[PDB]
Structure formats: structure tokens, C-alpha cells
Design a protein around this ligand. Structure first.
Ligand code: A1CBZ
Lengths: 141, 139, 129
């Protein structure tokens, strides 16, 4: 049986300077059943409950103060500003290399035309030495 | 359309001296039988559930052996500790930030009450939305 | 709609071995996909230690896919943590389209640091959507 559930799982472009850019045209990544990726945002095709998730991986070669943030935001139709749905702050430095993963997840009622963004404050600290470390997705329940 | 019991409640940024959960806010929900009664999530049916919660603490400098705790408890129709974490933000102004994330899968029974509590609500950070939450997902 | 929730065997210490109790099979420490379709794959592992050593400790947790039509191993989700008593949990989860016969594995690099006391914190599963 073929599912018609709006789903997305986009991955970060490891070659995008000073930014966390989401791609669907990669192995084990997808945009299906109405979900679109427009201006680095996931656009919701229909109203309903959705599971929203994102993971980023930060890495630094040592400690030089550094604040790392990762946020999933929602912009509703006819609105312009992002309202935080999920957000986390980490302080990796309280020269050995440090690693800081941030995982955000939750269930949210979304409306048709909503735009979701998964953003960070310090893309200079993003790590891409391996696949599956930086991602963002939604699944209609 | 799924009939899986789900919940995602957020802290009241105005409720001083407490970590009070709200479902009647934008981007917060109680669906498929889950209820929020007496600051607790009430389980509608038996089964495996993913339980999660994040709280963010922030202080304006370390003058002091401050202990920060975050716990998720279960009360059955028997009180058990499900998830717990302790953090010591003070090694020794210079602001500090301390997030505590708790997550896990637990077998819950119908009528179970889940609570997500902290010991220092005076250190809770509310300068931004989406930082303090409590949720459950039936599997 | 098949589901699978498997937990770490606390008696097979020194290796992250999975224990089962829907129709998703557990063969050779891997979850085997029964049919073509979409799936949420999640997991959690818990690490702990009594202190820090000279050699820099790196903790990793990865969920891989061995596609049946090509037989190679590709990361689906991965995370690294540098804990330097300490406790370090690692979470993963995402929706992937998978084919019949695909094998999923959830592995770590330091089983000597695994925490077997927490069953509700060392697990691996899938749910067909
Ligand atoms: C509704 C639906 C699709 O059927 C479903 N959603 C989620 C799960 C599930 C069960 C156990 C899990 N343990 C973990 N997860 C699980 N997901 C991940 C990662 N990590 C560990 C978390 O602590 C976590 C926190 C918040 C959401 C989150 O899910 C993420 F996909 F959005 C996670 C099962 N079923």
C-alpha cells in the first residue's frame, strides 16, 4: 500500500559557507506528498498534527565565550515572523576537540502554508566529517 | 489520521516561582485522550510511551554550590522516578547557561500521572519561546 | 503497520546487543524491513564514566542502512559527544523511505562506557508510517 502522508527529511549541504542549507536531492533524504523546500524552509501542504525534528552537530578544535543555539520556528500564512517551536542553548566551553550535538523533537498542530525553519547561530562550528549528523524533518501523523 | 495519544505542553513564563505547564498556548497540544490535570499529564491508555522534557537554567554569574535538578516522575493508580538529572553550574559577572534534557521510553498504564519538576524556578530562562517543554508520544 | 522496539542486553556486556520481546524482524543484531514504505527510526544510548583519562574520549552513536539492492552500509543518523562522574545520552530519530529486506543497525564505538542500568534509555526502534 502506498502512503500519502506529507513527509520531509532534508540534510545539510556540507559545502555551504557560513550557513546551514537544507537539501532534499541527496541519498536518504526526501520531500514527499505536498511538502516543499522554499527559501531554506519546509512548507506545510495541509492542516494536521505533525512530528517535527532536527539535529545539528557542532565541533570546535578547543576553547578560546561560545554560545550555540539551534531553533525550529514556525511562520503561519499572512504572518512574517518566526515563533520558536523548539529551541536549545549549549555552552561547550566551561587543545582537545569538543563535540556538541543538539537534538530537538516534538508534535505540533500545523496549518496549510506554514513555513518551518531549522536554524543555528554559529555555522562556523557546524561539523560534516560524516553523513547523518545534520538533518531536519517533518511527518504528518 | 492517527489516534495515538500525544502531548506537548510549555512552561508559563509569567508564573513566578514555578514550572507551570500550559496546553492553552499557541504551539502546545493535548491530543487523543491525554489530559493536563494539577500540573500533570494523565495517560489515557496502557502502552509504551516516549516521554521528554527540556528546561533551561541561566544565572548572572557564579559567586556558591548551586544544585539544579530536573525530574520526570510517575504516579500509578506507587510513585517512581522515571528520569532525573543534576547539574552544578558553579565551578567558582559572567553569565552561565545550563540546559537539562530528559528523554526515554517507558511502559505506562491507563490513569498514570506524569510530572516534570525542577528545584530552582528562580533560575529558569524565559527570554525566548520553545526552551522549556514537557511532552509524551504513544508508540 | 509493523513496529519494533528493541532494548540492549545487559548480560551481553562489552557489546551493544539488541533484544526483542509487530512484524519487524531482529536478525544478526539488525532490524530487517519487511516491506517497502516509509519509517521512523529512533534510538537512544546512555554513556557514563567515573572520570576523565589522558586519551581524549569520543563517544559516537550511529544508525546505518544496508540497502538490499546494493549491499553497502550508509549512515542514516550519527552523533558525537566529548564528555571531557559523568553521564552522556545520545538520541536519534528520523523518517527514511526503506525497501523490503533493508537492514538497520544501531551501533556505538565505546561499549565499555555503556550504561546497562537504564532500559528506558538504551533502546532502538522503527515504526512503519
Ligand atoms: C508519532 C510517531 C511518528 O509515531 C512517533 N514519533 C516518535 C517516536 C519515538 C519513540 C521513541 C523515541 N526515542 C527517541 N525518539 C523517539 N521517537 C526521538 C529521538 N530521541 C530519542 C528523543 O528523545 C526524541 C524526542 C522528541 C521527539 C522524538 O522523535 C522524533 F522523531 F521527532 C525523539 C515514535 N513514534
Amino acid at each position: 500500500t502506498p502512503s500519502d502522508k506529507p513527509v520531509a527529511h532534508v540534510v545539510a549541504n556540507p559545502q555551504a559557507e557560513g550557513q546551514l542549507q537544507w537539501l532534499n536531492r541527496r541519498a536518504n533524504a526526501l520531500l514527499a506528498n505536498g511538502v516543499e523546500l522554499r527559501d531554506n524552509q519546509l512548507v506545510v501542504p495541509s492542516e494536521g498534527l505533525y512530528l517535527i525534528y532536527s539535529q545539528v552537530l557542532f565541533k570546535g578544535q578547543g576553547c578560546p565565550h561560545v554560545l550555540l543555539t539551534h531553533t525550529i520556528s514556525r511562520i503561519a500564512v499572512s504572518y512574517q515572523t518566526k515563533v520558536n517551536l523548539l529551541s536549545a542553548i549549549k555552552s561547550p566551553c566551561q587543545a582537545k576537540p569538543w563535540y556538541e550535538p543538539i537534538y530537538l523533537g516534538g508534535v505540533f498542530q500545523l496549518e496549510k502554508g506554514d513555513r518551518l525553519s531549522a536554524e543555528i547561530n554559529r555555522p562556523d562550528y557546524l561539523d560534516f566529517a560524516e553523513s547523518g549528523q545534520v538533518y531536519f524533518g517533518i511527518i504528518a501523523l
